[PDB]
Amino acid sequence: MNPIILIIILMTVMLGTIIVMISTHWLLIWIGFEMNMLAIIPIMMKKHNPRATEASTKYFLTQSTASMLLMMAIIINLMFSGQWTVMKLFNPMASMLMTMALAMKLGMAPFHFWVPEVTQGIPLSSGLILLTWQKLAPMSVLYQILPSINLDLILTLSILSITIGGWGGLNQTQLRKIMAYSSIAHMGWMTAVLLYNPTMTLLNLIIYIIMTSTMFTLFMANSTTTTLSLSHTWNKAPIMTILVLITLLSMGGLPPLSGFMPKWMIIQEMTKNDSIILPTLMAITALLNLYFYMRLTYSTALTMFPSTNNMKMKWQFPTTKRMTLLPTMTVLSTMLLPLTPILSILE
Amino acid sequence: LLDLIWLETILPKTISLAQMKMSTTITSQKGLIKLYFLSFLITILISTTLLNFHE
Amino acid sequence: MNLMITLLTNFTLATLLVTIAFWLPQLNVYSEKTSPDPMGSARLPFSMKFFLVAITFLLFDLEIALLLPLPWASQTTNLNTMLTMALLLIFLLAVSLAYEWTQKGLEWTE
Amino acid sequence: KFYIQEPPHGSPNWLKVGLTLGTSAFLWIYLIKQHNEDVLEYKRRNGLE
Amino acid sequence: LQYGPLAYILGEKTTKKMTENSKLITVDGNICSGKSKLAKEVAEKLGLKHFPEAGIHYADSTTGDGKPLPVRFSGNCSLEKFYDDPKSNDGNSYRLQAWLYASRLLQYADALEHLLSTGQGVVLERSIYSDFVFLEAMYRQGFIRKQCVDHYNQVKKVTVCEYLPPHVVIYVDVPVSEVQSRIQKKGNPHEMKITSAYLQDIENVYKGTFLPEMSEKCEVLQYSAWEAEDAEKVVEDIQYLKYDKGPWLDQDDRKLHNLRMLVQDKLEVLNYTSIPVFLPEVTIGAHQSDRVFQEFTELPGRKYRAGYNEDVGDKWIWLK
Amino acid sequence: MSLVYMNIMMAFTVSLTGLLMYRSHLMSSLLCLEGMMLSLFILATLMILNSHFTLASMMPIILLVFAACEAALGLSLLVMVSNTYGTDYVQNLNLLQC
Amino acid sequence: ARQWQPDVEWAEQYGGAVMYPTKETAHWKPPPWNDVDPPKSNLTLNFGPQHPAAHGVLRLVMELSG
Amino acid sequence: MMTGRQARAPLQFLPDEARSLPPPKLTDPRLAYIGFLGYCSGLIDNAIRRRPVLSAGLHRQFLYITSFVFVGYYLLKRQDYMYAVRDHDMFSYIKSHPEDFPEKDKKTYREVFEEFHPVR
Amino acid sequence: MMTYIVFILSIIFVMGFVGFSSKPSPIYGGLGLIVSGGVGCGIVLNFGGSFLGLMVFLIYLGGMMVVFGYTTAMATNKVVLGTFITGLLMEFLMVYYVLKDKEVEIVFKFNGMGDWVIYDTGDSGFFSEEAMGIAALYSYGTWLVIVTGWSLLIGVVVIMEITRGN
Ligand SMILES: CCCCCCCCCCCCCCCCCC(=O)OC[C@H](COP(=O)(O)OCCN)OC(=O)CCCCCCCCCCCCCCCCC
Ligand SMILES: Nc1ncnc2c1ncn2[C@@H]1O[C@H](COP(=O)(O)O)[C@@H](O)[C@H]1O
């Protein structure tokens, strides 16, 4: 791929997300999602192997079905309210179809059946973009339609996303599928607190983006795509094993690490609204995520697996990969819990 | 009997094997896209008829 | 209504002449024959280039679909904006053709 | 000499160190001026002199 | 990093220095096919830069002081112990073959890096396309197992697909007995222990596998033993080659830019040499791994990046 | 409400259930997607004309243009799949099971 | 004596496609390491003796490439 | 929650009434922990690239500390602003609604009969 | 019956979507989608949407479905007839319900009158209102034309990138 065309295509991805974020007309929302998908398809097909074409095809089919259901929800809104203002919706059928469309775009369960496959087929950079940047625009639309969202529907999608994101990563060795099931579980955690406090939704989104960007940046820097290949990292750079240790311990929700912060604030807001059973079941299900994170930490950092002889040749050559913002993203994803009342800047 | 088997069994091992088996039920899919879109349609049918989320 | 009558009459004449062509010389019995090509039996290989010129047609046809309300849009009272956006859409069709040009898309069906 | 091929980080990158220290000290003096302007604006808006 | 995508955006296209003389040449032959001086002669006639055969310590020659490190840090393998005990129990044989394949992979990455950054053709000696010629000979002579050949074919499948073939292969037809006489005139007590059937399997895998697939993806030149001595005949054969075969034709600026961004990241070149297929001839235990790594880290010039070593006298670290 | 809107929504949901139940072909999935687009086009036109809402007359053209570019993108993905496997059968697309 | 570290027997546990290889998850391999699955042609036309633009009686077996 | 408040003047990081608040002092322990995060970022940047951790990039660590303090100062200003606006809305709502807030008649513990539960 | 032409074309539209979306093969599915696009175009044309119906026939059918049949020509059962007649049974039973009751309820409630009654009784002078609204894409739709043209230019670039295979 031409770097000029790479610049223009990534700016078109960002422009599609911006058009979804800043527009006051439902057609322009749909246009921004079309621009976003249409631009991010070549970033998935960067290496031109059959798994990336398969992944881009599954991604296309799911996002196109979501875009058509979104436009049907918009059209029912034009039926029952005659207008186009991006605000609450004026029909629970349009609200239900738009909630379904945004849950498809986020890969929330039970529309989760594309996110591990599509994350597996594409490279680590496009997987980073898919799991961080493509989670921005539908959370913005859910932020703007939350007076019309059915509470039962969003909590059912949230519990199903948390349970499947828990039980999915417990039998995985690929890193990209682990990050994808972590994405499904974290989207459940985000959408559960949405009708209670969407500031905590923004908080969970930003902390998940920081942690996910840290782990994908470490995966790009160490060229690891499986657990077993990740386990060789101590014999080449043990600081990378320490950082994936502390970051995977952060992403499960261990205190004092700052991935405990979002889910603790989500329990802090959901128990205000007299829901005590529901964040309890959410917190009990998050221990599955923390369990396969413990599996990954034992496989990588706290032990030392046997290696092969050709590591001695790689001892002699430094990393030339420009690890952009990786110390910043490791410091922010772990050590932000003393700065927890910074969450009011998202109000 | 108690403190290598049964107290070691009732809380942690039964839960561990249960989570093992449920993780095998989740992640044993045949990869087929037809089945996933069929499950999506089943979801929209259950959310329209069974739980009545359109109300 | 008159359009529907005209469409039905033209379609009826077409189907009537096709009925006469498939049943009046099929009154013949002539003879039980068997009749037992550049490619013999092998599968037709896909041509990437014919598909690319079809997609280039589809995208320029969408750009035409944007350009079609121009004889109505010349009547507007915002003529500077209309002339700007009209020149910009024809310019975007030209830039799409230029990127199809320079990146070798118009080759061997130029 | 030690190295057979000259490293990129053997000689210091004086343009990079100059940009680093200059931008850093510019942010420090802009932050000090911003904080003094903010304490003066607070002590005027609530009137604490 | 002086080169990146920004250097590609700002105008530097690597075909703006790609002349007709910029040809990657790999000279091939058996253990005494006399190609040693022939590659240097062909390099010095056309003005091409000569890269010799990668021994054990090529990676030592690229990094640090250039002087060879000990074998326990580079290789953990002895060619001499392979010549003495080819059917050895400790697994020196495939471990040596895998280290030599990684060394030739590194040398081939350096060769393409020089060819793409300078525009000067490079004369090589037994590139990675001619490294399995010794693997299959060791397998036919029973020196390693089937699983070692499987591991090598995995590493070849995930390494050689990332690279273009050479331009000119200069292979030298020498009989086995002349090679044996050159080994006996050499007088090396290790090199004389090489058997006859091993050399015959080397020649078999050469003439039946290497040239029948390098005859299409690149250009072969196949000389005898006594006509590979006049260098000017070989250079005249090189200068009059109709460059029409091979995938060096469909290489514009973007594809060679991808290749150049590949071959400067040496941890991406050597990414899948250490695939975790735990094979006992190369699998190092964790205690010995940590011990060799913490003895290697104490070596001078090796604890930090190559401009950050006080023990060898890198100044100005407090501003870097 | 209006009777024809039932038919257009039911055509949208029939094309949905066609898309949401694959048989063999990926081209049939794209055809079901564009049947969904077709029903959306018709339904938008009937609403915008019945409202006499003049400014949204340009909206169905925008729907048609953006989703035809979407369809061209999907046809190119299908073409690359059928270049890899020889057919556009969906059972070839299951290498991401593991 | 010293701190124990895992062996090959422990290392190959985490290295399948899944973590718990059961009856259902048994036939699953790891992918190729660079995520490149192996690719798993050119037309052959036979322009027979049916054609006037060939001057009379000619059969042409082409091998087109598009 | 407070999204109807900062929408009449949208996309203002710090509005015009944010200057009426006191700014955070430059010895703020919140800002000091942010500067410690800058120091840790400099140490991890010298560690992941195999530089000497404490000895290389004192200009680089100094810019990491400068950058985090410079961002975190305005982040703390916005934090103080949003909690101030939270309390201003709360106090204006309690003042403008006396009927929603009864002043509780505070019974002293002589009138309050709590049950005693004996630990015997 | 003649007051019901939009409704009868809509019944043919639903029947045609059941016809192709039961998916015999992409060739006949393309055929059924073309015939369905024609009758849905007739639905549009009977409300005075002349430009949008001609945008169906020109753009949708004459370009995009031509490209679909073009790709179907190059790239490339009991279940079909059974699900076909199942959808036809469901549709004709819903039609019999809404014709006996002048009312139906599946998701929404729907009136059973002739769908001419939902119109307006005015006029528009010397212009089609829908034509002038489409003409306002240039005077008013500046941002809309900018994002549509940029998405089409990116569409050309994206197709050329993902079909190059390098
Ligand atoms: C309220 C909502 C509003 C919005 C809130 C904020 C949202 C921020 C979301 C950020 C999303 C970033 C997406 C990821 C980066 C995109 C570009 C990219 O792909 O970078 C990787 C790039 C790939 O280079 P390439 O040569 O193509 O590699 C192929 C294989 N070698 O290069 C590399 O591989 C180099 C290695 C390092 C790459 C690091 C990239 C980090 C990007 C994220 C930074 C942290 C996020 C911002 C901080 C928090 C803000 C709230
Ligand atoms: N499997 C192998 N067996 C013997 N020698 C090998 C093998 N692989 C590489 N070589 C090298 O090939 C050299 C022969 O090339 P030369 O002596 O330069 O003609 C030997 O000296 C070895 O260093």
XYZ file of C-alpha atoms in Angstrom, chain I:
166
model
C -59.552 -2.535 -7.847
C -58.222 0.344 -9.954
C -57.901 2.565 -6.850
C -55.516 -0.075 -5.416
C -52.638 0.047 -7.894
C -49.973 1.022 -5.322
C -51.213 -1.755 -3.038
C -51.324 -4.413 -5.770
C -47.832 -3.463 -6.944
C -46.788 -3.728 -3.288
C -48.239 -7.244 -3.070
C -46.294 -8.165 -6.225
C -43.244 -6.517 -4.584
C -43.502 -8.717 -1.474
C -44.116 -11.794 -3.649
C -41.037 -10.990 -5.721
C -38.871 -10.554 -2.639
C -40.043 -13.972 -1.427
C -39.316 -15.218 -4.950
C -35.688 -14.249 -5.100
C -34.733 -14.249 -1.399
C -35.519 -17.965 -1.075
C -32.288 -18.149 -3.150
C -32.468 -20.801 -5.909
C -29.231 -19.573 -7.519
C -27.787 -16.035 -7.890
C -28.878 -15.841 -11.546
C -32.598 -16.298 -10.876
C -32.202 -14.318 -7.658
C -30.845 -11.436 -9.706
C -33.798 -11.867 -12.085
C -36.333 -11.755 -9.253
C -34.634 -8.741 -7.689
C -34.778 -6.943 -11.065
C -38.512 -7.650 -11.475
C -39.073 -6.607 -7.853
C -37.134 -3.384 -8.400
C -39.371 -2.667 -11.366
C -42.596 -3.095 -9.428
C -41.280 -1.115 -6.437
C -40.358 1.558 -8.948
C -43.993 1.474 -10.061
C -44.988 2.007 -6.415
C -42.718 5.075 -6.360
C -43.975 6.395 -9.722
C -47.604 6.259 -8.624
C -46.941 8.904 -5.938
C -45.442 11.379 -8.398
C -41.864 10.362 -7.649
C -40.893 10.446 -11.306
C -37.229 11.311 -10.787
C -36.772 8.739 -8.021
C -38.462 6.031 -10.071
C -36.223 6.878 -12.979
C -33.315 6.732 -10.533
C -34.424 3.169 -9.762
C -34.568 2.222 -13.456
C -31.404 4.063 -14.463
C -29.077 3.767 -11.481
C -30.267 0.695 -9.547
C -31.286 -1.609 -12.382
C -29.300 -0.281 -15.350
C -26.052 0.093 -13.451
C -25.859 -1.834 -10.213
C -27.925 -4.921 -10.994
C -26.113 -5.023 -14.340
C -22.872 -5.198 -12.335
C -24.407 -7.908 -10.101
C -25.376 -10.029 -13.104
C -21.991 -9.228 -14.654
C -20.147 -10.598 -11.625
C -22.573 -13.540 -11.415
C -21.690 -14.331 -15.042
C -17.998 -14.503 -14.128
C -17.540 -15.691 -10.531
C -20.099 -18.486 -10.924
C -33.753 -27.508 -4.704
C -36.715 -28.450 -2.497
C -35.777 -25.844 0.145
C -36.280 -23.023 -2.368
C -39.789 -24.035 -3.481
C -40.810 -24.936 0.073
C -39.729 -21.682 1.723
C -41.082 -19.859 -1.355
C -44.581 -21.276 -0.926
C -44.305 -20.819 2.858
C -43.749 -17.088 2.353
C -46.513 -16.980 -0.267
C -48.892 -18.669 2.203
C -47.952 -16.221 4.977
C -48.425 -13.243 2.652
C -51.764 -14.319 1.157
C -53.092 -15.157 4.621
C -52.058 -11.703 5.887
C -53.759 -10.196 2.816
C -56.926 -12.205 3.508
C -56.838 -11.017 7.144
C -56.372 -7.333 6.311
C -59.032 -7.559 3.575
C -61.647 -9.223 5.794
C -60.992 -6.944 8.779
C -59.800 -3.660 7.183
C -57.221 -3.946 9.997
C -54.121 -6.011 10.782
C -51.513 -6.069 13.561
C -48.150 -7.829 13.131
C -45.774 -5.134 14.375
C -47.859 -2.002 13.750
C -51.544 -1.496 13.069
C -52.459 -0.890 9.434
C -55.620 0.486 7.851
C -57.284 -1.520 5.094
C -58.581 1.360 2.970
C -57.488 2.244 -0.520
C -54.127 3.960 -0.077
C -55.187 6.938 -2.204
C -56.734 8.517 0.919
C -53.365 9.463 2.447
C -52.658 12.094 -0.198
C -52.854 15.889 -0.391
C -55.425 17.902 -2.352
C -53.303 20.914 -3.311
C -51.113 21.841 -6.252
C -47.521 22.919 -6.819
C -47.699 25.447 -9.650
C -45.165 25.307 -12.481
C -42.787 22.905 -10.733
C -42.542 19.429 -9.310
C -41.757 19.824 -5.613
C -39.723 16.603 -5.559
C -37.737 17.804 -8.589
C -36.897 21.113 -6.891
C -35.951 19.267 -3.713
C -33.526 17.134 -5.683
C -32.274 20.319 -7.381
C -31.573 21.749 -3.903
C -28.700 19.236 -3.562
C -26.440 21.979 -4.976
C -27.802 25.176 -3.407
C -28.414 23.684 0.051
C -26.651 20.317 0.135
C -23.068 21.586 0.135
C -21.817 19.342 2.951
C -23.885 16.468 1.554
C -22.282 16.764 -1.883
C -18.829 17.086 -0.270
C -19.175 13.917 1.801
C -20.864 11.986 -1.038
C -18.205 12.922 -3.587
C -15.421 12.195 -1.121
C -16.930 8.799 -0.295
C -17.155 8.028 -4.016
C -13.528 9.048 -4.630
C -12.514 6.914 -1.647
C -14.730 4.186 -3.118
C -12.713 4.235 -6.351
C -9.414 4.244 -4.422
C -10.558 1.477 -2.048
C -11.749 -0.778 -4.894
C -8.437 -0.276 -6.693
C -6.528 -1.120 -3.500
C -8.389 -4.280 -2.488
C -8.607 -5.681 -6.031
C -4.934 -5.127 -6.863
C -3.848 -8.045 -4.692
C -0.401 -6.614 -3.916
